[PDB]
Amino acid sequence: SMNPPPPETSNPNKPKRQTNQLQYLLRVVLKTLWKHQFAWPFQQPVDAVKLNLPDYYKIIKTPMDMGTIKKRLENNYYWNAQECIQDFNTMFTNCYIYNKPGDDIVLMAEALEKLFLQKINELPTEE
Ligand SMILES: CCN1C(=O)c2cccc3c(S(=O)(=O)N4CCC[C@H](O)C4)ccc1c23
Predict the structure, then answer these.
(1) Nearest Cα to 116, choosing from 86, 78, 94?
(2) Is the CB of 69 within 6 Å of ligand 1?
């Protein structure tokens, strides 16, 4: 049983930007989702060993989680907001791939994803 290396959160050769939308995504969107009662399963990479889900990383080849996204934001890892939004979408999509409609984990993702879409519907305009 082995978890893979988690996604990178630092990369000096990546071009980085401190964007008004990216600050919003950390200060407002991520930190609001982070406090939700259903956020805890998404706050770190899936530990397929602890959770005894040995087939998780057989199926999920681009893992993502809100703890990785929080580190990426706090270390100024993104060039623009769409890169950060795509990591959220990967995280939600992975959960819907590995799991089935009706699963408790999928009810949690569906709630988080609707809040997430509410919060990003309006981003501060690129000043
Ligand atoms: C989001 C990443 N991710 C999955 O794809 C997934 C599949 C099955 C279980 C599980 C758990 S759990 O065992 O802690 N638990 C959490 C609360 C609701 C259910 O009871 C399951 C935590 C995080 C998970 C899973």
Answers:
(1) 86
(2) no
Structure tokens at 96: 């819907």
* Ligand 1 pocket member 77 (CB < 6 A): no
Cα(66) to ligand 1 centroid in Å equals 14
Q: Domain spans of the chain?
A: 19-123
- The neighbour count for residue 14, using CB atoms within 10 Å, is 12
| Structure determined via | X-ray
**Fold classification of 19-123 (topology level):** Histone Acetyltransferase; Chain A (1.20.920)
Start-end of H helices in 11-103 = 20-24, 31-34, 56-59, 66-74, 81-98
With a 6 Å cutoff on the Cβ, whether 32 touches ligand 1 is no
Q: Nominal resolution in Å?
A: 2.0
